[PDB]
Amino acid sequence: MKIVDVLCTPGLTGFYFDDQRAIKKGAGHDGFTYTGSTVTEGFTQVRQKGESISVLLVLEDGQVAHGDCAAVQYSGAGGRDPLFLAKDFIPVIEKEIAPKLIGREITNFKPMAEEFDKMTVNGNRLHTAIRYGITQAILDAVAKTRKVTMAEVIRDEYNPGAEINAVPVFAQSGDDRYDNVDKMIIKEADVLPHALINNVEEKLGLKGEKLLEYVKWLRDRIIKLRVREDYAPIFHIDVYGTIGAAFDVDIKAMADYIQTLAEAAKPFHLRIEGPMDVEDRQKQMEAMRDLRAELDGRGVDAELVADEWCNTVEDVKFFTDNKAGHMVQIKTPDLGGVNNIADAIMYCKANGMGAYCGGTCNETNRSAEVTTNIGMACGARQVAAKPGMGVDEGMMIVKNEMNRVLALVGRRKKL
Amino acid sequence: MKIVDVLCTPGLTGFYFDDQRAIKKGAGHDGFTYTGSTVTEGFTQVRQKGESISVLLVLEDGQVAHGDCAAVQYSGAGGRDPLFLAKDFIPVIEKEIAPKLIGREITNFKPMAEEFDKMTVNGNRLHTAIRYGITQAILDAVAKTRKVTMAEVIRDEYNPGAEINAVPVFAQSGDDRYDNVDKMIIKEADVLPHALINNVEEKLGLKGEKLLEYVKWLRDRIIKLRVREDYAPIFHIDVYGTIGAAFDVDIKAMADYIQTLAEAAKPFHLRIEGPMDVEDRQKQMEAMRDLRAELDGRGVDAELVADEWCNTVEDVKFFTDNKAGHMVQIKTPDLGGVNNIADAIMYCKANGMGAYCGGTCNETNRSAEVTTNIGMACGARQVAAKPGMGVDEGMMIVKNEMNRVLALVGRRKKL
Ligand SMILES: [Cl-]
Ligand SMILES: [Mg+2]
Ligand SMILES: [Mg+2]
Structure with a gap:
């Protein structure tokens, strides 16, 4: 051809x-x-x-x-x-x-x-x-x-x-972290809500008390609204380094706080994106690596998701090789060629690192369908509902594509 | 095949x-x-x-x-x-x-x-x-x-x-009729904002004074925010029969009021959807017909858009045959077979009636692409940006699909 x-x-x-x-x-x-x-x-x-x-x-x-x-x-x-x-x-x-x-x-x-x-x-x-x-x-x-x-x-x-197979779909709320959570529960997002916790005082709380309240609210909201009792999504909350800020990047103190969030999330599982955001890639890798090691050594059931300082394919490999968190964000638009997404996910797979096949609210319906296909092909741990901030539209684009692709694949398997 | x-x-x-x-x-x-x-x-x-x-x-x-x-x-x-x-x-x-x-x-x-x-x-x-x-x-x-x-x-x-050719894209605001207007201006909606004027006292004003204020706000906002000075969108505001309600379906009173809106909208052209919403189809056709006759007779260049009581292809023909408004809403999901959309648009066009190729916020990215193609093929007067209430996504899906179709049609012309 x-x-x-x-x-x-x-x-x-x-x-x-x-x-x-x-x-x-x-x-x-x-x-x-x-x-x-x-x-x-x-x-x-x-x-x-x-x-x-x-x-x-x-x-x-x-x-x-x-x-x-x-x-x-x-x-x-x-x-x-x-x-x-x-x-x-x-x-x-x-x-x-x-x-x-x-x-x-x-x-x-x-x-x-x-x-x-x-x-x-x-x-x-x-x-x-x-x-x-x-x-x-x-x-x-x-x-x-x-x-x-x-x-x-x-x-x-x-x-x-x-x-x-189907990949868990992760929806992001922006600042509308209550109403958009409702949308997500009704649309059965597998992972939610991001929550844009991007300010220590307004959003985390100086002692983390605001995000603690939010996690409890979120747990209860899912229980109240869910159509199916067995709908049990994973929490994924991005703190924009504010946990690091609030607890002076003290490994023990961050872990203790994250433990209180895990405990507040129960029965739901908790992922925290970008717990700290420090001064260079090396120290970010280290702090992520060290906080994971603290969480894991203690058996605190919470996962850390890399983002800040982990941008390139090389960065993905670097964070992966070093267990710098439990899940690495694969930043689809920023990678250029979409083949880089596939290599980045497969690197994570080969090394047992969770891969989050991401994206931007500022891309398109078509680009979302394409990268969703790649996330599915590579067995990513989660894929982004995108683009847009309407939530409904991103969920629709990604999940409908997902379902259709599985239908075609299942047909082919049976020919 | x-x-x-x-x-x-x-x-x-x-x-x-x-x-x-x-x-x-x-x-x-x-x-x-x-x-x-x-x-x-x-x-x-x-x-x-x-x-x-x-x-x-x-x-x-x-x-x-x-x-x-x-x-x-x-x-x-x-x-x-x-x-x-x-x-x-x-x-x-x-x-x-x-x-x-x-x-x-x-x-x-x-x-x-x-x-x-x-x-x-x-x-x-x-x-x-x-x-x-x-x-x-x-x-x-x-x-x-x-x-x-x-x-x-x-x-x-x-x-x-x-x-x-391209078709004007119409974006809807829901109740968020200010910030969604900002979105629409920035995305250069050809037609906007709908505005969901579905309450007399709270949205129209008992004497229409709230919508008058809104039209003035809308006018000023476009002029303030537009990137290009020659961006001149058409206003399309749905009043859910509340103009009928506020003015006891008095043809002159309704026409007088709509004139003050047209005057307020200047330099922008005004379309009013569903000015009255009366007791049956026959009387709806009559009120729409008569209100249009009054506006045209006076040379008030404000269009009326039919909706309520105009549902089926029969209805579209009925409303068209009787000049019951200047434009009829072609209700894509409700017509069933999408061939009916084409038949309805073509009927309007054969008979001097504006065709609004519509839809629902509750349909899909794909159905939006398909009906967009239909509205383009039949030279509809406008098409809905849809689905969703995010505005961005609906405009993206419809407009991007329109651009691509035109590039492919243009290439084929030249082959
Ligand atoms: Cl909210
Ligand atoms: Mg992040
Ligand atoms: Mg209407």
Whole structure:
């Protein structure tokens, strides 16, 4: 099968590009917008529409493969590629990538994805979001040529011999940590709610007393609302380093506090994302490693989820090799080529580290379907409901795709 | 080309099944939940997860066509088919419909869609939502067999020789009619915000003064926040018959008031959905017809959009034949077979009536893509950003799909 044409369209995403720099300088609020001047190159307003580029690969047989380029909310922030405005990046795809794809015989997903993930233009690597979308489209093209699901392509090429099963779906609440929890319970999120505990005094409590109250509330809320008595989701709460802040990154003290949260969560299991956020990757690895060791040596039944300082494939391996937490967040948009997601999950698998196949609220329906397929193919421990902050829509996109893929896979197994 | 297999999976949607009757009886709010006993048969809580059924048609060539069965928020309410639980309806599809699809030759969309829209089981018509999803899947099957877009199939079979262009996207705010307006401005909704003006005293004002204030706020907000100075969206505000209520359905009083809204909206054009909501279809048609005649006679360039009492294709024809408003809402989930959407749009267009290709917050990403294609193919006056209440996601799904379809149609023109 040849690729005969490549088309690019600008588009929207599930969220916004936010000028993180301007917000951190103290941008004000006005309705759903921020006030004041922009700081970050490229921004015309502090909050602006998130953007995507749909990449279509027209195949020789007339099928159309489809992936979406997209970036995080804080596109163009510190350590990130420039603000992902479709107008700025469609030209690179049209001029530099299309000629390399047009007339290409579709081969395996891995070599083609690695090629396009690594290709340079004028000596420079491609924007992370371009690599994201192009490799999604390549994955879909291989699936379509082979007449199987994307999950099956990935399983064949990265996880051979394995079954493809449902993956627990993790929904994120943002600041609406009560109402969106209700949505999650009604939509039977397997893992919930994130809860955006991103401030010591307002959200954690100076002694952690506010998050303690919240965990108890959450436990009781699930019990009150759940349609099925056997609905027993896993708690996953991101504290944005605030536990570290509140207890001076004292290993014992953090563990003792986390123990009180586990105890408050019972009968539900507790995962804490980003317990501390310290000054460099080395010390983050160490503190995560050390807190896990404290929790495990004591048999405290709580899991730690890495995030801050654990960004790249190399970082994933680093956190994994060192048991720096119980679960590692695989940050799908930031990895560029989606083949990197599969390698990152398989690295975690090989080493018995939980893999959380993540994402951004600012990506698309299509990109979410694609990375969901990869999470399923690689037997990830959880996948993100995304994109958007509506919760309903992200759950729908991810879980419906999941169910459909399992149906097709199950059919194939029975032919 | 034949369909060789049919697979149904249960899924989620952009919103909830709500027991309207229980809510009208006074179910209380508790977080994102409603308190108290259910009233409508089928319901186990007043608010439960909205449900879909993904229908997959495996074609002989290995391609998989995909439509989603879905129903309105108030599934099982007065005049509606029963609560659309996947578990209640997957067996119907599997027993009564799948055997008719398996082995079925892909011919043209229209005759196939009509057959499945009209087919009976033990003498009874199928649930609207089943006909909705089945016929979507058929459309996608025809498109995939022909190697064209769904929009192209519909254009060929219902709008021969027409160009397929973008369609204005209409976004709805719910009760969050300020912050969701900010979202819509930033995402450049072509038509906005709906505003859910469903209460005289609290939302319209007893003398319409609250909506007048809101229209002024809306006007100023667009001008304040718009990135481009030439962003000039059309206002579309649904008043749920409350203008009729506030002004005792007096044609002149209603026209006078709507004139003050048009004057307040300037420089933006105003559409009012459902100005009155009277006692039967006949009197609804008459009031809409007469109120339009009064506005047109006066040269007040404010449009009326029909909704209440205009449901079926018959209703659409009736309202159209009588100029009962300027635009009619084509209620996608409720019409069953999606071929009926095309018939309804084309009727309006043949007869000088605006067609609003609508939908529900409680449908899916996939059904939204399919009906978007239909609205595009038939040159509807606007299409709903849907599903969900997040706004972002609905705009993303519909607009991105519209962009991609146009790129593919444009390429094909040139081939
Ligand atoms: Cl909340
Ligand atoms: Mg985090
Ligand atoms: Mg209405």
